[PDB]
Design a protein around this ligand. Structure first.
Ligand SMILES: NC(=O)c1ccc[n+]([C@@H]2O[C@H](COP(=O)([O-])OP(=O)(O)OC[C@H]3O[C@@H](n4cnc5c(N)ncnc54)[C@H](O)[C@@H]3O)[C@@H](O)[C@H]2O)c1
Ligand SMILES: *C[C@@H]1CN(C(=O)CCCCC)c2cc(O)c3ccccc3c21
Ligand SMILES: [Mg+2]
Ligand SMILES: [Mg+2]
Ligand SMILES: [Mg+2]
Ligand SMILES: [Mg+2]
Lengths: 494, 494, 494, 494
């Protein structure tokens, strides 16, 4: 039961958020934000750059000083504040979902049910960890009492993408704040608006000034000012593998800030002949087509065992033709646009390369309409490993179906990539489920399912799909810096 | 390479061990110890009773005093000492395996390979935990610094059975000493000898006097003096359910000592029609017949799905006929005797009740030989839930085979017992493996195997099969007592 | 800022709570509940006995069946429900606090601020753990995949006292429910009313029927029916050491249910000559006098170093005379009554024994008024270790002040008791704070403070003050039963 | 019992170690290795470069393949192998200590007692973790079974310095192998020899070929080939800040390899007026002067409260005059040389800058001897924060003494650096010990001691002193890569 979206949405929060106040850009420049389904301008936003990032970093640093309200507050109160923030998101759920759909080209009921649901659940999970992040007491050698503190890391710069704008925002700030950090967040230039609304809710919830700062603007300006900043203790980034390398490099060049990255993928989904086919087809399909193919974890290499290949192809093609393209706020639309022209063209070019290189176009395979960035859902069969569409992250509604016969071969092929974010396996065989999931070089492996992401699980990549984990117990701990304290005593006892 | 067993074994360690010295019993009484295969007396051992336990408890208490060598030693030195002990057991393996086989009625190659191997591995595992048992620092409300210590509990009384005498001995002392406790061990009256040899090695390894004390003797005398003792901080018991109840009652009446129990079982082994049959037959067979059926975890209700039941029965019966009974030191013998007359008679009485209640006797069914307590390997089929042989722990070489046709039924029947020590499930279906293992009320559930016990895993019962877990990470934490220390400070910071 | 208490409170929930419904006692009997400050009857409550407990246990067992709503619900939803319950407590805070003050003889603003605040904080802490209770994956020997499940224990019987009725109620149900158990709760006969109100809020929050059942009634009837019940998996108890022994015994005799206990104390508070005296006097004072001396953790042996003894006595006596006795709902009253006549007389008798045995009565020392169970706040000096008032838990407003000179002596004297719940030390010396807190045989040790209890910390006794811990990470885990699952695989890899 | 050092040492292991075999460099070049006390050449070693690193990386990759001996071995056997290696180091202790002292300029009794002792203890600690590294099972939302594996990361390049060559070698390989990784080690060009001896012992202990590979050689050649390598999964580096930046940059540019760094320091040691002076003088003195000042953690800003500053200076100066410089193998020598010319000259240049900037030269201040790189022990007083000797890591026997009078000031001054490796605080005040240790931005804070480093504790820097922790529980988790496995099931139960 999903309400009707708001239609005549008026914008309010369009400025830089520092110390719980709204500021104009130091330059005075602004940049436009668009609806990808219509190409209309939604509003303009202050364009943050280096000098705005520097103010935000100062604010975050002051809020993190020993003795400050955020440092001396009970851990349990950090938790309380995070739950209050989630209450405010629930109150503003329609507004946020509409806003997210409009700005992001995202199907409204998905934005309402999945994105917003995920935002709330994430924050609630995080809230619960605040007073449960613990250090140790250690029975070291000699007459000493030794303990550790799990302290916050400090000022954390957080740079995020356009595909799940609000959700990614909360994935970053929730764990950081739960652990006691302060943050400077740089939303994607395509999708600042829901993040800016969150600023108003952070203030309303009662967070002290300087605890969250938000600086909308471009990557090589505001983004790079964060990655290179001499007083940012940690940078966390989600985005393209290419900018990820630049972030790590900049961290090295500047102050050796801690780095965490999630960079997208080319995730294999392997379907063995004993799999439940109905289950497998639907999961594989959603796994590559969700949000117009704009998921990091997209099942973009679908390996199907020979004896079921033709049938799986047939069913996949049938499934891919059940969409109605158009405005994602409009009742009955089941596929939205891609986010912007750069992505649209990237994807068309890759689609052309699959045609040129001999893959079999089964459906779709070109643009749709004459307004907004729409691409027809496309399936290719007889794809081979050396094709661009088998190698490169497409980030559009383009499914690749490939054949295998040997178990050892499909594992080596699945693993033969610099990516490692996720993978899926479909089989009813216990032994294969365990051993194949052990052998895949992927951060998450799903078994008889795909795209199952929950706040209780750590999430992130092997190899060039990432450094570190987000969420679960394991993620939390990476927003802490360990301090060992060792005290000389006259006599130690067990 | 299993070497030849020693033959002409001379006994040396036959006394009460306290403060690293050997003592006569206070009464001067001794009790005889027998070889169950031949009924000949091996030697006499000092008969420990209440007054000897009191001496052992004072020794253990003194060794536990704040400022003693054992309390002030580095945790890592506790670990070194445990590893040194394991070296000594390695050195003395042939002698201990021989002794264990003679005293216990145990197949000599099994004593040498399984029991002794397990002793060594258990101690090595324990040794590694010693300086890794850690407390916490805790972000509690208010201007306080709080931490916890994982202290040893103190003086632990440890009462053990006759079926794996040396391995049980090490299962008790290893974790206890790892965590810094002192102990008073009470070996079974049937099988004190390898434990007494262990005293010599504990001394040789260099443990401080009073850290391990061993009081051979009977149950209602020495055992009960431990369970009722007003200065024992914890009792750990492995044995019968009946006596476990007495121990727990004694603890309640005396000084509320902490209690952990492992009490045996009536463990179900469920073989689904989709299972690998060769694998299931062998594991289920070893699962009930191992060590003349004298395993707490014996797979003594074998539920087999109707479509494969007859075949499974036929194959189990054929497998059960491949034994040579005799002296467990003699090459080619593959089944030894039961431990003693009382067990022998309990088993024959239960075999008799199966015949009387209408079970189908497939093979075996009575004694063998003219010396020592031997029973033919016995298989009953068409067993039903209401039969004594389906409800009571038999603890001899007696297999019950029953059938089932519904998943829900067989879970409910498996669970319908006051026991809950272990269970097995044989299937190739992923869903059944996870969901049935979740639904079984048993401490250890094996899938496509049985009797896989390892030091890294916690082991113990649901329901009346026990309280607490032994070994693994979890075991070690039940040999500690948690102390919270909360220190007022002028101002807390995260 | 505390509101005025309700004055004309009408009672509504007076029945047995089973399956989210209100039931008459099977017998039809009822028992009266009184205001201890006035001796007026508040109302009558259904008198639960064995047959009511049996219905409650059946309900709890059915709610815990595999497939039931409570077993299949997301862990995160158990958390959500617990936070909703805390929201309802906040909504009903005035009502509950008034009710608690009236029924319990508790100072209203303490009930409002401390008890109710604690109730809410406790539940919020618990809620946060629900989806963070995790098992393990274990790299055991051999070709196996091994994991553990932290499953709930089952049906947990929970028996509680009259001193902090609502708070103790939530201490029990919060962690149990967070971990997925079902419960049968037996409030104290003196103080059922706030617990019964909680039943209405549990239903209103949405908990499934049978998840919490509440059976008001007496100890040797309803209490003993729980401790002896053959289908209760665990009993948790707070109360007198005497009934604790009976609970453990009954657990042993019946079904070996798991036992956890918190049993009160004789806690030492040690004040060294370098202590801040202002701080120390006020903490020691509150530490023994809070809630009319009716805290388990009462600082009822106050050891003061010789050179400051006379001054500490003087200041303590002055502090003890600053009370206004009377009705705990009345503005300006700072000391309420004791809970009932049995306690009142226990305390008077102990006060008489201190007079008889030669302690120096410094103030108070007898009853007050002629209605309700009021005792004048009493301080004794020159108390010695062999006096009844130095040995026995008094549970009334009676402070014992004792002298020491030697550090080693005061430690041995502090430790010379069967009790071990808590202790305090006041010193500015780092070395003493660490080493003395290590040497004290007490579950919680406070340093330069006293009575600091928070949900993030495990809480419970050494020796005869308890078995197990409540709250913190450590408590949570004791409402779980560990299951190890070991799966045979073709080949294991690290 | 420190034995006499060997004199007439013959070298045997001088080559590149790959797959348990010794190789010439691919170029055929060798490089000379010197004794810094005498400047004489010890031997020549094969000069490893990019092509030799490529060979080592292929070997390590192959040894890491799914199904290899190293991947399929029981975790507990990894532990056994580590303990066996520690046995071999024990056997070869005199030879290794002699070698370490000759090659490193290190006091022979310190090499034998401290360095070698530490090597052995570090490996024993690591050995015990191997089969105790565990993942999780996770109660995630929905009908799923989720678990995590703590897998090894893979191929780890490990680049180490000249100051504790063998101990650093074991600090790197111990945890890495414990967790199941394979490695490529690059010892410092000044000090390859004990590491090459270790290759022989790795082979003798029985590790599979390719599990450890060692490539002696220079930094910008072999080191850089590791940090840039497209098939190394993680680089771990201990050394200068400057080079740490290069490594992190190289990782970003190449394959986003995981990076951990320990980079040295400018560690403050704060002595309050209430401290025990005798204790503080000695710890602060050893804290800066140990191993000719060549410790990352050197207490190189000594802040002393004004009321005791002059006395502290006087006593420090007297202590600094009790050295005999010479060959560190000669009985009675208590200070050896600096490692090499470049370090020697860096130190003299810094000493010079102290004189020029107005520090008060109390003793020492220039070179000594006519052979080897010796510098007089030097103490400067009246040092101020802006001086080169207060800002830069000197890494020679040079003590800076400064004064302070306010707690707030001294914390701010201690923290005002880009380093954050360690700090010490000397005080007897409980409040200061906890609160100042909390406020210091340093990885290890010692209280009333200094330089207490133990295998059970995590060790590493805040800020530009490092990324990540080594050793303790926490260290071991950075040699793992977390994989989440999520399996669809028909119905989940708690
Ligand atoms: N630890 C504590 O917080 C605590 C609380 C109350 C009392 N006490 C101590 O105990 C003394 C006596 O108080 P009490 O008589 O009110 O406490 P108690 O131990 O009798 O009662 C505690 C709870 O146990 C129940 N109970 C009583 N008898 C039982 C039995 N035979 N089987 C099962 N349950 C039973 C009661 O009905 C109540 O719910 C007090 O003076 C005090 O010293 C300690
Ligand atoms: C009874 C004991 C004391 N207490 C306090 O809050 C005293 C504080 C007084 C100074 C303002 C307290 C609190 C909680 O939460 C408890 C829980 C369980 C057992 C005992 C207590 C106490
Ligand atoms: Mg880009
Ligand atoms: Mg018996
Ligand atoms: Mg009573
Ligand atoms: Mg250099």
């Amino acid at each position: 039961d999903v309400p009707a979206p708001l239609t005549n949405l008026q914008f309010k929060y369009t400025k830089i958020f520092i110390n719980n106040e709204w500021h104009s850009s130091v330059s005075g420049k602004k940049f436009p934000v668009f609806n990808p389904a219509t190409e209309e301008k939604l509003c303009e936003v202050e364009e943050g750059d280096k000098e705005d990032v520097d103010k935000a970093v100062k604010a975050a640093r002051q809020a993190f000083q020993i003795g400050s309200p955020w440092r001396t507050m009970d851990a349990s109160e950090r938790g309380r504040l995070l739950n209050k923030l989630a209450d405010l998101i629930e109150r503003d759920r329609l507004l946020l979902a509409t806003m997210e759909a409009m700005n992001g080209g995202k199907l409204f009921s998905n934005a309402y049910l999945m994105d917003l649901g995920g935002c709330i659940k994430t924050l609630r999970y995080c809230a619960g960890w605040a007073d449960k992040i613990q250090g140790r007491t250690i029975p070291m050698d000699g007459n000493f009492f030794t303990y550790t503190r799990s302290e916050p890391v400090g000022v954390c710069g957080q740079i995020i993408p356009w595909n799940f704008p609000l959700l990614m925002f909360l994935w970053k700030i929730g764990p950081a704040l739960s652990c006691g950090n302060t943050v400077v967040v740089k939303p994607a230039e395509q999708t600042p608006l829901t993040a800016l609304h969150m600023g108003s809710l952070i203030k309303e919830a009662g967070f002290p000034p300087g605890v969250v700062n938000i600086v909308p603007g471009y990557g090589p300006t505001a983004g790079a000012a964060i990655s290179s900043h001499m007083d940012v203790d940690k940078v966390a980034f989600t985005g393209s593998t290419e900018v990820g390398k630049l972030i790590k490099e900049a961290a090295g060049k500047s102050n050796l800030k801690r780095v965490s990255l999630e960079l997208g993928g080319k995730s294999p989904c392997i379907v063995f002949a004993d799999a439940d086919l109905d289950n497998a087809v639907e999961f594989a399909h959603q796994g590559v087509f969700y949000h117009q193919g704009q998921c990091c974890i997209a099942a973009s290499r679908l390996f199907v065992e020979e004896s079921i290949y033709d049938e799986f192809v047939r069913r996949s093609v049938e499934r891919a033709k059940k969409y109605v393209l158009g405005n994602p706020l409009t009742p009955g639309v089941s596929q939205g646009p891609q986010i912007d022209k750069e992505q649209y063209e990237k994807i068309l070019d890759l689609i052309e390369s699959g045609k040129k290189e001999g893959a079999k176009l089964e459906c779709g395979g070109g643009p749709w309409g004459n307004k907004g960035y729409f691409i027809q859902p496309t399936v290719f069969s007889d794809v081979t490993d050396d094709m661009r569409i088998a190698k490169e992250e497409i980030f559009g509604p383009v499914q690749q179906i490939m054949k295998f016969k040997s178990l050892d071969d499909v594992i080596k092929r699945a693993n033969n990539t610099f990516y490692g974010l996720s993978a899926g396996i479909f089989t009813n065989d216990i032994d294969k489920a365990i051993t194949v999931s052990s052998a895949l070089q992927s951060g998450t492996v799903w078994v008889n399912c795909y795209s199952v992401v929950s706040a209780q699980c750590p999430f992130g990549g092997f190899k060039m799909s990432g450094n570190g984990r987000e969420l679960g117990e394991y993620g939390f701990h990476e927003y802490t810096e360990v301090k060992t304290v060792t005290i000389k005593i006259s006599q130690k006892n067990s």
